[PDB]
Design a protein around this nucleic acid. Structure first.
Ligand code: MG
Ligand code: MG
Ligand code: MG
Ligand code: MG
Ligand code: MG
Ligand code: MG
Ligand code: MG
Ligand code: MG
Ligand code: MG
Ligand code: MG
Ligand code: MG
Ligand code: MG
Ligand code: MG
Ligand code: MG
Ligand code: MG
Ligand code: MG
Ligand code: MG
Ligand code: MG
Ligand code: MG
Ligand code: MG
Ligand code: MG
Ligand code: MG
Ligand code: ZN
Ligand code: ZN
Lengths: 102, 25, 81, 130, 64, 129, 225
RNA sequence: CUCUAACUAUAAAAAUCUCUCUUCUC
RNA sequence: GGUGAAAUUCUUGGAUUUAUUGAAGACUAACUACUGCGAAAGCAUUUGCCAAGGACGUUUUCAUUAAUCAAGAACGAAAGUUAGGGGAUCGAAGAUGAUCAGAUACCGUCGUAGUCUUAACCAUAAACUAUGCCGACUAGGGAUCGGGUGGUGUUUUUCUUAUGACCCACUCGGCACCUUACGAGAAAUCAAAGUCUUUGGGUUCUGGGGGGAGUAUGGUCGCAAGGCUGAAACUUAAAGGAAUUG
């Protein structure tokens, strides 16, 4: 049966999309159905920001961050907890799940 | 059964019979 | 909706709607009389003019090609005729 | 794992509703009360009702809350919602006499054909992102 | 070498581990009280105790 | 400068066997190549933070012996074709370098990233663990 | 951490005792002329240290070479050419962005514009310059995005191409670096392209050397002093 | 009726399975 | 190195990780979206040339020149096949060390043919929107892309009139989306899958229970793999769709 109106792909008018390889399982997958997470992260955690700070010349450093855009597959994503199997009536809500940190 | 492999078996039979016919002529 | 005078609609409805959709379709363009700064010779110009309409007297462009209404010479004087 | 089930809660709530003038914040006094003035077959259930009623007494004295609405609180709400201020706070009087409007509302007033003293002003129609 | 260290727990961070017996604790060292570190401890714990560490460099994550 | 002896830590942190390999500013002359696997016995906890921490401590001792005090860290992952993601050990190695006396400056992310080169390993359906 | 197959298909010496330190001096255009120190093997003829040194590259943040923090995201490469003794002189080699700022300003909902150019400088240096630009929300936006039409990218890209062509072919690498320090060329590009589209945060990326004339000893001597 | 910030990290192995299926009006 | 672990394999002839480089081949990240184009397959670095195309604008031109299409035709993913140019990664077949009862499978290290091209073919895919095309109408709301309209609109400064970019309002066209039934169906659901027992706008092509089987043979095209055309004998009372509860 029609599980999702958008076919769970989000292509709808492109015919074919360039495949991309999963970060973990290395599966080729259409770039739109290639669930994507902007892993923007500080290069060290708060448990070491101090340790680095007092061991730092150039007081009050900018502490540069590391950015990445993880292109998961879907099998790894569902297994590695990125995406969760939600209920039928809750599928149609495409907003991010309510401000991860508030 | 998965129709892919049934078709593969059928085409294997086709190849065998065609080779037999070619050897016959 | 469900009760309208399609025969006597408000003039605002006439203006807002696209042409070919009015009760009778009349092109939204028009003709203008324009005075070139150089010579006093008046010339008639279509609103969405296509080719650069230089006056027959002198090589002075009055309109410039554009997807819509042509752009004038910034000095000439136009009046809706 | 004591959660003071539905029956004791409803019984104490009804006791509140009908008897709040005649109740106190002391467990023993309310125990003797609820034993004398409400038929309770078992002593344990009586004591549970008295405890919940005393807890609700302390709650009500801490402040009126949901669900409980007895005669005194209802009378307070009656005398409190009938509050009528002085001059109507619109009254063409407050907020710089002759109130501010917008040009479009001004021309509504003009088209109406009535006086309605006025003060025209524009809007600076810039739409803020906010 | 005897670099034994002492640390007082200020907050109990629930309990971690598949066994369900090991506690994450946020301990501030008795020496250099300005510094805090989170570590795993096996056995009953309550805030206000003071605990002993053979190593203080190791940061302890969840025990999977 | 305060008469300092600058260096570069340039940690390489894969998902196995975190690397700590300090060299000079020119980048050619190497100091204290000791890695995570050097200091753990299992050959499989090499990516664990303990290996990186002991490697970093030994690097720090060698640096104090050779005079290099302040460092310019260049954090690296395997990157390129492989997962573009920093390993867990390298961060702990960086922290251990921070603790043991040495000073830091201009920590850098030097992860090698391709512009879609290298039709890479895995096959169509990829890993099937 | 013990032994291995050792498929060989003591005599140990100390690494540092036979080693020695050298100093690095920056071009006079840079603010903090003293850069740092580099490790060498001890000087022995027949492969003197001089042969090993000339050609090395030193990799230093621009904020280090100026002092202020506004130059944190930039990062200059210097080429080792001349050895003076206990101190070596280095000519300009290249200049680059730190990957962090680049990855930070490449966001969604604003397409980028890249402009590559290969140009000879004033004197003889063949160089390659990249320019990175990002579309800007005008401070009245209600449309949540700022895409630019490929005609606009064509115009902006070409304009940057001639801008870099002029600014490199006219002045030498020293004067080039003089324009590079206070990023006057960036604001110049922003102004020259202001009529096309807002174009937030233009910048010069990966100033990459390609070719150098012979040595020009006198140029190096004038550079450092 | 003025509001655009914070983050972590697991995939060892696991095959097979007998009867006997039927009943709602006042 | 690599993994859940374990070796396979390279290593003081200094493997791995270092700095410069150079080589060939590949692709064109990050921007990259419920976003653009094209008949479909498909198409993503820059620049020049070549022609082409939709939409908009048009008080320009011909006046039925139109739609669908049996026959015929052009494109037509990947894989495959010829030869020649390439030869990096990756990698079907093979070679290897682990998993297990066995594993020539899943994890791993090499690895031909293939991936890349130039001519020559082949014409099939879950080629899917599983919805043929052209028409007309029916319900509200937002945004988005392309175009054109008005803004005494705002930012822009080349004093400033012009641009450009936004903001607003309107309109034409496309990918779409949200609410809803007052219609539809079996229902999932659909704003088309509606305007259908109140059965009729024009049109091509498909199917008659399930296996046999898209198989036998006959053609037909192809060097080859096979493609298109395509049954029966016989067997069976179900196979199947959708949702419901365990
Ligand atoms: Mg299903
Ligand atoms: Mg999706
Ligand atoms: Mg699995
Ligand atoms: Mg080596
Ligand atoms: Mg576009
Ligand atoms: Mg299309
Ligand atoms: Mg791109
Ligand atoms: Mg036909
Ligand atoms: Mg092919
Ligand atoms: Mg070949
Ligand atoms: Mg085996
Ligand atoms: Mg095999
Ligand atoms: Mg299995
Ligand atoms: Mg394999
Ligand atoms: Mg391989
Ligand atoms: Mg077919
Ligand atoms: Mg079909
Ligand atoms: Mg079709
Ligand atoms: Mg049949
Ligand atoms: Mg069949
Ligand atoms: Mg045939
Ligand atoms: Mg079903
Ligand atoms: Zn995956
Ligand atoms: Zn004239």
């Amino acid at each position: 049966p029609k599980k999702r109106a958008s076919n769970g792909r989000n292509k709808k008018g492109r015919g074919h999309v360039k495949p991309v390889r999963c970060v973990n399982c290395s599966r080729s997958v259409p770039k739109d159905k290639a669930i994507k997470r902007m892993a923007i992260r500080n290069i060290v955690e708060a448990a070491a920001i101090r340790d680095l700070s007092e061991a730092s010349v150039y007081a009050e450093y900018a502490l540069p961050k590391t950015y990445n855009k993880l292109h998961y597959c879907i099998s790894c994503a569902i297994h590695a907890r990125i995406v969760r199997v939600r209920s039928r009536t809750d599928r149609r809500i495409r907003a991010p799940p309510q401000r991860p940190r508030f | 059964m998965r129709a892919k492999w049934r078709k593969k078996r059928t085409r294997r039979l086709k190849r065998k019979r065609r080779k037999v016919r070619a050897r016959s002529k | 909706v469900l009760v309208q005078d399609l025969l006597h609609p408000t003039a605002a409805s006439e203006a807002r709607k696209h042409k070919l959709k009015t009760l009778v379709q009349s092109p939204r363009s028009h003709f203008l009389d324009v005075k070139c700064p150089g010579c006093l010779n008046i010339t008639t110009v279509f609103s969405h003019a296509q080719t650069a309409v230089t006056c027959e007297s002198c090589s002075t462009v009055l309109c410039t090609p554009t997807g819509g209404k042509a752009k004038l010479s910034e000095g000439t004087s136009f009046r809706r005729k | 794992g004591r959660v003071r089930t539905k029956t004791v809660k409803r019984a104490s709530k009804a006791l509140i509703e009908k008897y709040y003038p005649k109740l106190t914040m002391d467990f023993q006094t309310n125990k003797r009360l609820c034993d004398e003035i409400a038929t309770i077959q078992s002593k344990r259930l009586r004591n549970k009702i008295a405890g919940y009623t005393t807890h609700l007494m302390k709650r009500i004295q801490k402040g009126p809350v949901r669900g409980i609405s007895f005669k005194l609180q209802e009378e307070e709400r009656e005398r409190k919602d009938q509050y009528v201020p002085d001059v109507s706070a619109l009254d063409l009087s407050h907020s710089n006499d002759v109130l501010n409007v917008d040009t479009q509302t001004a021309e509504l007033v003009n088209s109406l054909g009535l006086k309605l003293p006025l003060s025209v002003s524009s809007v600076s129609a810039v739409r803020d992102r906010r | 070498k005897t670099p034994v260290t002492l640390a007082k727990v200020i907050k109990v961070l629930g309990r971690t581990g598949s066994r369900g017996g090991v506690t994450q604790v946020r301990v501030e060292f008795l020496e250099d009280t300005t510094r805090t570190i989170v570590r795993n401890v096996k056995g009953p714990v309550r805030e206000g105790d003071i605990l002993v560490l053979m190593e203080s460099e190791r940061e302890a994550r969840r025990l999977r | 400068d305060n008469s300092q002896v600058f260096g570069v830590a340039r940690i390489f942190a894969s998902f196995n066997d975190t690397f700590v390999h300090v060299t000079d500013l020119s980048g050619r002359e190497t100091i204290a190549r000791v890695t995570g696997g050097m200091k753990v016995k299992a050959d499989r906890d090499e990516s664990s933070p303990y290996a990186a921490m002991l490697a970093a401590q030994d690097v720090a001792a060698k640096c104090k012996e050779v005079g290099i005090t302040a460092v310019h860290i260049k954090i690296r992952a395997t990157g390129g074709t492989r997962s573009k993601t920093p390993g867990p050990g390298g961060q702990a190695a960086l922290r251990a370098l921070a603790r043991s006396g040495l000073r830091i400056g201009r920590i850098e992310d030097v992860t090698p990233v391709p512009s879609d080169s290298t039709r890479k390993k895995g096959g169509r359906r990829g890993r099937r663990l | 951490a013990v032994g291995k197959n050792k498929r060989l298909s003591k005599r140990v010496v100390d690494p540092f005792t036979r080693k020695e330190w050298y100093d690095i001096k920056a071009p006079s255009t840079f603010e903090n002329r003293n850069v740092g120190k580099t490790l060498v093997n001890k000087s022995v003829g027949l492969k003197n240290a001089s042969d090993s040194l000339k050609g090395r590259v030193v990799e230093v943040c621009l904020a280090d070479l100026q002092g202020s923090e506004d130059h944190s995201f930039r990062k200059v490469k210097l080429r080792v050419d001349e050895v003076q003794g206990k101190n070596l002189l280095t000519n300009f080699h290249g200049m680059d962005f730190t990957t962090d700022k680049l990855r930070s300003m490449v966001r969604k909902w604003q397409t980028l514009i890249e402009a590559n150019v290969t140009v000879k400088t004033s004197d003889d240096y063949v160089l390659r310059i990249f320019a990175i630009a990002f579309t800007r929300k005008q401070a009245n936006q209600v449309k949540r995005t700022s895409y630019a039409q490929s005609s606009h990218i064509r115009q902006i890209r070409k304009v940057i191409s001639e801008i870099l062509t002029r600014e490199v072919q006219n002045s030498t690498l020293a004067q080039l670096t003089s324009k590079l320090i206070p990023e006057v060329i960036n604001k110049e590009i922003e102004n020259a392209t202001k009529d096309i589209f807002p174009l937030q945060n233009v910048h010069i990326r990966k100033v990459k050397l390609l070719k150098q004339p012979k040595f020009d000893l006198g140029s190096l001597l004038s550079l450092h002093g």
